[PDB]
Design a protein around this ligand. Structure first.
Ligand SMILES: Nc1ncnc2c1ncn2[C@@H]1O[C@H](CSCC[C@H](N)C(=O)O)[C@@H](O)[C@H]1O
Length: 453
RNA sequence: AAAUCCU
C-alpha cells in the first residue's frame, strides 16, 4: 500500500524514541506518534508521509498501556515541559536505563559494561530550582506559562508540577503585578512589547530567591514600585536582576545584565559547603539528585590525599570545591566570567586555598596545563549537551591521567566521546544513570573511564 | 544547538 496525509490506519507501538515519541512500522515506514507508549493499539492519523520515516497522531485508543498515567494535569504538560509524564515513574527509570545501554551500543560499540539501574527520586515532583517562564498576550490578557513543543504558542499555567511550589507562587505573583502595572508583554511576531521572559532561581536548602526580568528595552516603567511589592510577598528575594535582549531569537538572555535590587547573586548549599550563584551562571536544576550525582562521581574517582584533580567545565565550582579538602590540588576551567568569578569566591568562602581556576574554553586550558607541566591524576568533566571536542579528549589523554569521570546530560555525545577515549587507551569501567530530570526524556549519567598500562 | 517546553 501507499499511505498519505489524513489516512487513519491501525498500528501497534513497539518502541520509544529517545525524546519520548512512540515508534511504529507500517509498509517500510517508521512512524513517530506523539503520546503513544509501547504495546498500545491505536488508530493512527497520518500527518506527514516522508521517504523513509513518517509522523502520526493518535486518532483513537483501542488498547492503552498498563504503564500509562491517566493524570489529567500531567496530560496538559505532555507536549511541553513534562514529555514523559504520561509514562509511569518506574518505567521512566527503566526507559532511561535502556537509553544509556542502547546508545553505548549503537554509538560506542559497547555491549559488556555495567550500566546499573537509574537512581530515581522517592517523590519525583516539585524539584526544579530554576524556572524560565515566557510572558505573552493570550486572548487580550498577559499570561505566564509554557510553550508547546515545536512552537512559541504560550499555554497559560500556574501549577508547573515539576517546579518548586514557591517559584510557582512567585511567577504567578509577578504575572499579577505585570497586569496591575500595565507593562506590555512581548509580541514575537509583531516585534512589540517589553516583558519577554521571567527567570526565577531559588535555593534548594537556603530558599534565597533571584528574579530576572528579561526585556527588549533597558527602561522598565515603574519597576522600583513593582520590585517593592514582591519583597512584601516574598522577603526571601535577595536580588532582582534585569537582562536586556533586543534581538529576535529563541535564546533567552542577551548581553547586558543589570542589578535592579539587592545582591547580584543568591547563596545555596551543596553537600557540606555553600555556593554563591549569579544570574547568568549555571546551577544544577535538581540539587537533591545532583548531590547524589556528585557523590557517585566522587566514589567512582576513588580520591586520595596526594591526587591532583581537574574539574573541567567548572561552573561555580561545585564538584571541585566538594573534593578540594580531600585532595592536594584542584584545577578548574569555565568559559563564562560570572560563573568562574563565583567559583573563585566560593573557594574563599569555604576556606579552600588550593582551588585554582581559569577563564577560558576547556580545550584551551587543557593545552596550557599539558604544556606548562601539570600532572593531573583525575579528570572530572561536566560539559553541556554538545559534549567534549576532539582537542580536549586528545589533550586530556596526553596528560597521563589515571581516571576520568564523565558527567553528562546527553548520552549521545557522551557515547561519541567515550568511543574516542577507548581509541586512546581508556577502558570504560562503570556507568551510573541518575534521574535529575523526572517526568522528562532527559538522562543524567556518570561514567568512570580508567587507563590501561 | 542554546537552555524542563523554548520549531
Ligand atoms: N567550551 C567550553 N569550555 C569550558 N566551559 C564551557 C564551554 N562551553 C560551555 N561551558 C560552560 O560549562 C558549564 C557546564 S555546566 C557546569 C557544571 C558544574 N560543574 C556543576 O555541576 O554545577 C556552563 O557553565 C557553561 O557555560
Amino acid at each position: 500500500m501507499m499511505l498519505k496525509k489524513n489516512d487513519i490506519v491501525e498500528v501497534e507501538i513497539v518502541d520509544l524514541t529517545h525524546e519520548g515519541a512512540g515508534v511504529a512500522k507500517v509498509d517500510g515506514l517508521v512512524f513517530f506518534v506523539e503520546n503513544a507508549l509501547p504495546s498500545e493499539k491505536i488508530l493512527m492519523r497520518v500527518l506527514k508521509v516522508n521517504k523513509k520515516i513518517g509522523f502520526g497522531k493518535v486518532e483513537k485508543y483501542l488498547v492503552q498501556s498498563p504503564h500509562r498515567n491517566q493524570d489529567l494535569d500531567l496530560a496538559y504538560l505532555r507536549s511541553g515541559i513534562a514529555d514523559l509524564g504520561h509514562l509511569s515513574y518506574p518505567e521512566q527509570l527503566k526507559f532511561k536505563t535502556k537509553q544509556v545501554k542502547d546508545s553505548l551500543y549503537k554509538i560506542a560499540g559497547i555491549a559488556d559494561v555495567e550500566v546499573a539501574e537509574t537512581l530515581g527520586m522517592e517523590h519525583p515532583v516539585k524539584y526544579r530550582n530554576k524556572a524560565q517562564v515566557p510572558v505573552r498576550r493570550v486572548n487580550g490578557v498577559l499570561e505566564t506559562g509554557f510553550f508547546r513543543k515545536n512552537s512559541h504558542n504560550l499555554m497559560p499555567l500556574e501549577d508547573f508540577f515539576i517546579q518548586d511550589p514557591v517559584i510557582d507562587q512567585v511567577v504567578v505573583a509577578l504575572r499579577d503585578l505585570l497586569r496591575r502595572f500595565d507593562l506590555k508583554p512581548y509580541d514575537e511576531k509583531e516585534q512589540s512589547g517589553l516583558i519577554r521572559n521571567l527567570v526565577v532561581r531559588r535555593g534548594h536548602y537556603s530558599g534565597q530567591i533571584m528574579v530576572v526580568l528579561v526585556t527588549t528595552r533597558p527602561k522598565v516603567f515603574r519597576v522600583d514600585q513593582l520590585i517593592e511589592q514582591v519583597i512584601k510577598q516574598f522577603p526571601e528575594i535577595v536580588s532582582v536582576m534585569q537582562n536586556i535582549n533586543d534581538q529576535n531569537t529563541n535564546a533567552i538572555f542577551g548581553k547586558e545584565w543589570r542589578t535592579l535590587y539587592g545582591q547580584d547573586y543568591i547563596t545555596d548549599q551543596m553537600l557540606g559547603n555553600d555556593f554563591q550563584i549569579a544570574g547568568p551562571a549555571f546551577y544544577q536544576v535538581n540539587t537533591e539528585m545532583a548531590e547524589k550525582l556528585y557523590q557517585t562521581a566522587i566514589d567512582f574517582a576513588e580520591l586520595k590525599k596526594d591526587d591532583v584533580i581537574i574539574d573541567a567545565y567548572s561552573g561555580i565550582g561545585t564538584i571541585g570545591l566538594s573534593v578540594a579538602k580531600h585532595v592536594k590540588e584542584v584545577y578548574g576551567v569555565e568559559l563564562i566570567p560570572e560563573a568562574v568569578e563565583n567559583s573563585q569566591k566560593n573557594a574563599s568562602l569555604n576556606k579552600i586555598t588550593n582551588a585554582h581556576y581559569v577563564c577560558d574554553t576547556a580545550e584551551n586550558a587543557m593545552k596550557k596545563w599539558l604544556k606548562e607541566g601539570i600532572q593531573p591524576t583525575v579528570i572530572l568533566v561536566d560539559p553541556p549537551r554538545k559534549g567534549l571536542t576532539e582537542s580536549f579528549i586528545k589533550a586530556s589523554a596526553q596528560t597521563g591521567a589515571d581516571r576520568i569521570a564523565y558527567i553528562s546530560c546527553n548520552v549521545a555525545t557522551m557515547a561519541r566521546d567515550i568511543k574516542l577515549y577507548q581509541e586512546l587507551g581508556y577502558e570504560l569501567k562503570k556507568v551510573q544513570p541518575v534521574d535529575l530530570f523526572p517526568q522528562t526524556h532527559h538522562v543524567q549519567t556518570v561514567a568512570l573511564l580508567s587507563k590501561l598500562d
